[PDB]
Design a binder for this molecule. Structure first.
Ligand SMILES: [Mg+2]
Ligand SMILES: [Mg+2]
Ligand SMILES: [Mg+2]
Ligand SMILES: [Mg+2]
Ligand SMILES: [Mg+2]
Ligand SMILES: [Mg+2]
Ligand SMILES: [Mg+2]
Ligand SMILES: [Mg+2]
Ligand SMILES: [Mg+2]
Ligand SMILES: [Mg+2]
Ligand SMILES: [Mg+2]
Ligand SMILES: [Mg+2]
Ligand SMILES: [Mg+2]
Ligand SMILES: [Mg+2]
Ligand SMILES: [Mg+2]
Ligand SMILES: [Mg+2]
Ligand SMILES: [Mg+2]
Ligand SMILES: [Mg+2]
Ligand SMILES: [Mg+2]
Ligand SMILES: [Mg+2]
Ligand SMILES: [Mg+2]
Ligand SMILES: [Mg+2]
Ligand SMILES: [Mg+2]
Ligand SMILES: [Mg+2]
Ligand SMILES: [Mg+2]
Ligand SMILES: [Mg+2]
Ligand SMILES: [Mg+2]
Lengths: 56, 114, 121, 120, 209
RNA sequence: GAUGUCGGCUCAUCACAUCCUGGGGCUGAAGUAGGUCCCAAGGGUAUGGCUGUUCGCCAUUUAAAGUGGUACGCGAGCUGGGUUUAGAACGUCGUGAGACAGUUCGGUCCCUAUCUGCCGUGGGCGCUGGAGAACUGAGGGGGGCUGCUCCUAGUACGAGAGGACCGGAGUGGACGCAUCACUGGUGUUCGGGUUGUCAUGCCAAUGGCACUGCCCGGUAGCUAAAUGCGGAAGAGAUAAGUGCUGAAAGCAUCUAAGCACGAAACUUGCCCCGAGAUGAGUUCUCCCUGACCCUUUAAGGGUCCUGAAGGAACGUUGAAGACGACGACGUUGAUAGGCCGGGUGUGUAAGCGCAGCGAUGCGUUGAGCUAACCGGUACUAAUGAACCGUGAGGCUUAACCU
RNA sequence: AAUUCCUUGUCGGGUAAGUUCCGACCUGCACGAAUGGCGUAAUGAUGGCCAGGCUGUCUCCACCCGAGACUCAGUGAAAUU
RNA sequence: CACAGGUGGUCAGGUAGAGAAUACCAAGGCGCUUGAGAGAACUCGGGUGAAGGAACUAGGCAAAAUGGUGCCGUAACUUC
RNA sequence: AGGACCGAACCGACUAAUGUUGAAAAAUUAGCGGAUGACUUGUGGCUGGGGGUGAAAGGCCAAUCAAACCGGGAGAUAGCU
């Protein structure tokens, strides 16, 4: 099973109309620190929902 | 479940004796026959066992006229009426299906005895 | 119970092995049991008896391994499939005696002559 | 269909998916902290707590049974003695997960499984 | 007449004095409260909309709470229309219960479905399997031949072939009514209706005899 | 510069010269059963023995085992038995190599689907302010089979033998849907037995490996063989047909005027989809009512302040599920996990005590362990925000209202 | 009949039913005696037929354990046109 | 090709075993140069299957089954 | 004693599935045949193309065989595409 006609460069583009990437809906920040971390998980070092887990 | 089990705990008969995968028991069930409605007895041996609330069975092996028979009673069925024990035995198992291939001398099961 | 299938004789004459060659009761009918008519074919038979190997008649399934269930759900089963040969032309048994306990499912006006023999239920 | 079926198979035979957790279990009981996969974490969870909940009682059988699983008399000692009384009053949640995910080799999501009373 | 919205959870038995263990699906009707009446002057048809559940009043959009308010507000899993004829109800929560049934042996019961999804012929179409042996290469349980040839050209519509199995209305019709014991808000039937417990059901008098 | 043969399998779809069931005319049609023709394509329309067979013959069923078109439908779907390769042999022909529309034993069946087309399932935009819902129902699809028994009535009919109509009741076969409450299956995530061997120092107790090592039983879930329901009635308009009153055509006539019945076909009734129904419909509820400028002026464009309803995103997850989707919940909490109690399932743990030389037995003990289950419980995880979406809705006419 | 065209010859056996199979008949299209005739114990991954056991081969498929398929991250083909 | 193929000789521990079979191990050497999830149809390799039991099919193809030692005992036929 | 029996190595290749843009230009997996013999294997040698070798299939003679591979006659000839 193979293509009978070379798919135009146009058809290709349409097929890649759903391949577009997604942003991040903006990420949150921390209270204890200005850590610009991702929602629901550890900051760059050890913070999260305030507090500060994971030694150093 | 919380609403149900009530319609079950409301049906479940409290008039039922002990049991065991080795006992004999003599289940006395209705029959109706024709115009009558006697009470047929069933002398067998419990191999399988209920334990599911309203829904429950014993499965008794008898072997009537030279032919092994097996019946699964619905413990809480009005057609069950009474149910004796006759003889309790030591099995050391929960399901004695390994009896569908035994017969006298081989099917023998040492009584309970406490 | 379904084509082929070896059943035992629940009566006398031409006992032992008898193969079912057709499940009567309608088109594409799958299996039989409880108390249904079946096309039999004596495979063993006794030296004397009333029928001999090769005979093609019909019979009633008196006992099955699967069993039978009644309202409450309680089921009754036997370790083996037994049946009774009956006159081809107009039903009714051909044997003089019925061996083994039957089921109250045969308490029908026709299958009467059998439920009235020794055994039980 | 998985309809109402509990338990995660990860991607291997139960055989393997037993000792990998048995090691990861005693591993947690040891360093009290671990950085594994999120799924492989939300699983190790209901594998140690049952052990700690078992550690609640000193006993002499719950000890052996504790040795049955996690074949390490080392950690079974850590249990009953440490985490045992450590959570002798703890209701049940003896663990934290602290997500973080995103590993190098694989875009796999990691996590930080740790005893609730680990911070000092 | 009209019907009532309930929740599945049943599947039990009820032994008769005679000795029959009747199957049964325990549907629960917490009484439906007509949230709105529809006339042929402001709608174009005689219909009644009710409710039965009780939303946590936390996941209810204001446009919803406003709807309930417009009438006899009291939250509820959702809304349900009920085409009625020759007999109206009070626009305000007339609070109808399982008592709506009694001398009604009909009933239909309409749940969601089963939810197989996986689909695949042989299971969602009862197709046949090709010899699991005697050769057959990678073609055991598979469609095999969906069309004909050149003459036909394409593959006729409706052609059975895998695809999502489940999640779809589907009723039952008939079904006897074991007990219409209100109070506890219960309705028992002969048994076997779509849904998998908790699933919203629409039990109404059978359209057929 | 290749359109793979016959049969089988799997899956079909159409025709009507209809096999069954339905409606009728004539009969050398008593009845019951037939015969032949007309109408009718809704639905249904056999398992085996022999052979590669198709077919056919035969056994035994059924209400019936329809005929035909679809590349003698179907190999980028399966088979490779027949049939054209190369091996070999027989009969036969030829001096012979070899040959046969003769036979015989043996003999590699490829393709990850771009386009159309189907089956499912999403992502856009459009429906003219934006939302959350509930509908309406144009249309489209699904389903349409049928036996036997009984009552009518052993009546009508009939010399009897035999034996209805019509109408009603019950229970089946095959098929479809659904659901696990029952019966069972499975259940390598539960419990136990056991063979070999290795290890944890040894005893004891355990764990690894040997198909889950072999095996016994089994929870939830999923299941069929299990269980419950369904192809209906009834309407409309008809077919063939039967006719009424009726002239042409002094009568006669079903028709020319004019009326009435009439079948599983057609329209509807039943179940499902369904407003992209661009002819994009309807009803209920909810939200936004700050300032300015450039202007090449009804066309805007642009700025700051504002961001609601609701959505989405993330997290805990589901009887939902390939991914998307759809549902529940997010501390105003039972959404998952854990935890408690119970259930169930296994089947009486370990330790100790005692009896026996011992294997082992009894006691503690019906113990111990126990999952997807039930009831409950914030112990752990479901963070305040943040993101999107705005700021009163074009014109023309009509109706009201002012 | 590894040989028979008519051919599923005819009969018997086996089967509920056997164009195959076995035993016969002889009407050998077109067997036949070292391009050997007819037999033959044993042997055979040899051709045909039958039976017991056995079973998911099938009636009719169900559940479950693993490797793919599906999802994400990295690398990254093909015939064809 | 850092390819499931091919390649001659030597050595030969423990338990069980007839054994250079086989299973579990010693010495020793390895986990096979993409991983992380999910728990779909369908394909591949397996496990268990009610009742029936070759009805399958060209054909029991494939499966399932049998499986050891000792002893008892064993037909036609035969070149003994 | 035995071209004797069962069965590893070793030799071989009857069956099925999978592979068929393969892990592989013939293999993998589960079965299978021989296994003191016309057995099997290492090293080196000898037969050369109309020639070799062949327990005979036209089989093998470097993934090539009804006449090898390489260079030449050579721009063979091509009433065909
Ligand atoms: Mg293992
Ligand atoms: Mg192949
Ligand atoms: Mg066309
Ligand atoms: Mg016609
Ligand atoms: Mg036929
Ligand atoms: Mg064709
Ligand atoms: Mg192919
Ligand atoms: Mg062939
Ligand atoms: Mg040849
Ligand atoms: Mg046969
Ligand atoms: Mg002969
Ligand atoms: Mg000759
Ligand atoms: Mg010769
Ligand atoms: Mg992939
Ligand atoms: Mg990728
Ligand atoms: Mg490598
Ligand atoms: Mg079975
Ligand atoms: Mg056959
Ligand atoms: Mg067949
Ligand atoms: Mg085989
Ligand atoms: Mg095998
Ligand atoms: Mg030898
Ligand atoms: Mg050998
Ligand atoms: Mg050499
Ligand atoms: Mg070569
Ligand atoms: Mg020249
Ligand atoms: Mg040239």
């Amino acid at each position: 099973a193979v293509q009978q006609n070379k798919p135009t460069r146009s058809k290709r583009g349409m097929r890649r109309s759903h391949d577009a990437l997604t942003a991040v809906t903006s990420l949150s920040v921390d209270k204890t620190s200005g850590e610009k971390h991702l929602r629901h998980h550890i900051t760059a070092d050890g913070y999260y929902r305030g507090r500060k887990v994971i030694a150093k | 479940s919380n609403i149900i089990k009530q319609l079950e705990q409301e049906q479940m008969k409290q008039d039922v004796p002990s049991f065991r995968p080795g006992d004999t028991v003599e289940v006395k069930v209705w029959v109706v026959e024709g115009s009558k409605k006697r009470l047929q007895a069933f002398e067998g041996v419990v191999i399988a066992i209920r334990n599911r609330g309203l829904h429950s069975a014993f499965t008794v092996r008898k072997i009537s006229n030279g032919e092994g028979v097996e019946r699964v009673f619905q413990t809480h069925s009005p057609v069950v009426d009474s149910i004796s024990v006759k003889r309790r035995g030591a099995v050391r198992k929960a399901k004695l299906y390994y009896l569908r291939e035994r017969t006298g001398k081989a099917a023998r099961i040492k009584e309970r005895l406490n | 119970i379904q084509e082929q299938t070896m059943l035992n004789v629940a009566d006398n004459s031409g006992a032992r092995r008898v193969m079912c060659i057709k499940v009567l009761g309608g088109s594409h009918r799958r299996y039989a049991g409880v108390g249904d008519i079946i096309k039999i074919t004596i495979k063993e038979a006794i030296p004397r008896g009333k029928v001999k190997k090769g005979d093609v008649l019909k019979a009633v399934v008196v006992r099955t391994k699967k069993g039978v269930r009644r309202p409450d759900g309680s089921v009754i089963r036997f370790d083996g499939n037994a049946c009774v040969l009956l006159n081809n032309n107009s039903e009714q048994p051909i044997g003089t005696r019925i061996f083994g306990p039957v089921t109250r499912e045969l308490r029908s006006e026709k299958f009467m002559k059998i439920i009235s023999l020794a055994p039980e239920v | 269909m998985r309809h109402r079926k509990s338990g995660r198979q990860l991607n291997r035979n139960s055989s393997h998916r037993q000792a990998m957790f048995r090691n990861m279990a005693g591993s947690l009981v040891r360093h009290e902290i671990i950085k594994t996969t999120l799924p492989k974490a939300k699983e190790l969870r209901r594998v140690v707590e049952p052990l700690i909940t078992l550690a609640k009682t000193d006993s002499v059988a719950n000890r052996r049974l504790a040795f049955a699983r996690t074949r390490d008399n080392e950690i079974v000692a850590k249990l009953f003695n440490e985490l045992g009384p450590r959570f002798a009053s703890r209701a049940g949640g003896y663990t934290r997960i602290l997500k973080c995910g995103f590993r190098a080799g694989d875009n796999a999501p990691m996590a930080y499984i740790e005893l609730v009373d680990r911070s000092e | 007449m009209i019907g009532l919205v309930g929740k599945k959870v049943g599947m039990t038995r009820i032994f008769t004095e005679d000795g029959v263990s009747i199957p049964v699906t325990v549907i629960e009707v917490e009484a439906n409260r007509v949230t709105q009446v529809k006339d042929l002057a402001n709608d174009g048809y005689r219909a009644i909309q009710v409710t039965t559940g009780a939303k946590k009043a936390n996941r209810v959009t204001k446009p919803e709470a406003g709807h309930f308010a417009k009438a006899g507000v009291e939250a509820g899993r959702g809304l349900w229309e009920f085409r009625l004829a020759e007999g109206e109800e009070f626009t305000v929560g007339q609070s109808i219960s399982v008592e709506l049934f009694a001398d009604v042996k009909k009933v239909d019961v309409t749940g969601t479905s089963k939810g197989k999804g996986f689909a695949g012929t042989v299971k969602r179409w009862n197709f046949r399997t090709q010899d699991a042996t005697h050769g057959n290469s990678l073609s055991h349980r598979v469609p095999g031949s969906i069309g004909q040839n050149q003459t036909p050209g394409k593959v006729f519509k409706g052609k059975k072939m895998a695809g999502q199995m489940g999640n779809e209305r589907v009723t039952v019709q008939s079904l006897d009514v074991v007990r219409v014991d209100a109070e506890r808000n219960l309705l028992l039937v002969k048994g076997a209706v779509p849904g998998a417990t908790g699933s919203d059901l629409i039990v109404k008098p059978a359209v057929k005899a």
